[PDB]
Amino acid sequence: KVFGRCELAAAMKRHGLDNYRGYSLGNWVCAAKFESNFNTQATNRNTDGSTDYGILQINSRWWCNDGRTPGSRNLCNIPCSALLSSDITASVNCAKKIVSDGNGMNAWVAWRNRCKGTDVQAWIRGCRL
Numbered sequence: 350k351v352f353g354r355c356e357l358a359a360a361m362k363r364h365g366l367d368n369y370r371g372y373s374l375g376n377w378v379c380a381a382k383f384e385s386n387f388n389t390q391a392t393n394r395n396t397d398g399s400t401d402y403g404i405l406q407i408n409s410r411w412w413c414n415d416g417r418t419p420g421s422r423n424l425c426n427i428p429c430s431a432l433l434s435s436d437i438t439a440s441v442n443c444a445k446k447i448v449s450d451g452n453g454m455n456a457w458v459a460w461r462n463r464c465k466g467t468d469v470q471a472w473i474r475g476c477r478l
């Protein structure tokens with residue numbers, strides 16, 4: 350599923366991401382935009398052999414099991430393919446564990462490089478939230 354901007358914001362808000370660990374909703378929408386272009390089926394392989402999955406590009410090195418990342422962890426206790434569903438519940442619940450690990454949203458390289466220090470509230474402007 351390719352989400353619309355406000356559709357995603359509303360779904361993220363419903364699942365409790367607005368101001369989760371202090372990150373306003375605009376941060377999460379900006380991150381999804383530059384990680385996946387709002388596409389739940391997005392995948393990308395990393396140089397170390399691991400793969401990033403879903404609207405928030407969650408990594409198989411630590412967070413999910415894809416059967417092809419040897420020596421990795423599965424800290425969200427999910428198959429990575431669950432992160433590609435049109436239902437973002439698994440992605441959002443896993444993202445809540447990542448952002449709590451001590452590094453905040455700096456865990457997402459796209460957020461640090463393209464969202465951090467910008468006006469992230471612009472990403473929800475015009476949405477009925």
Ligand code: NA
Pocket residue numbers: 409410411412413414415418421422423
């Ligand atoms: Na893994």
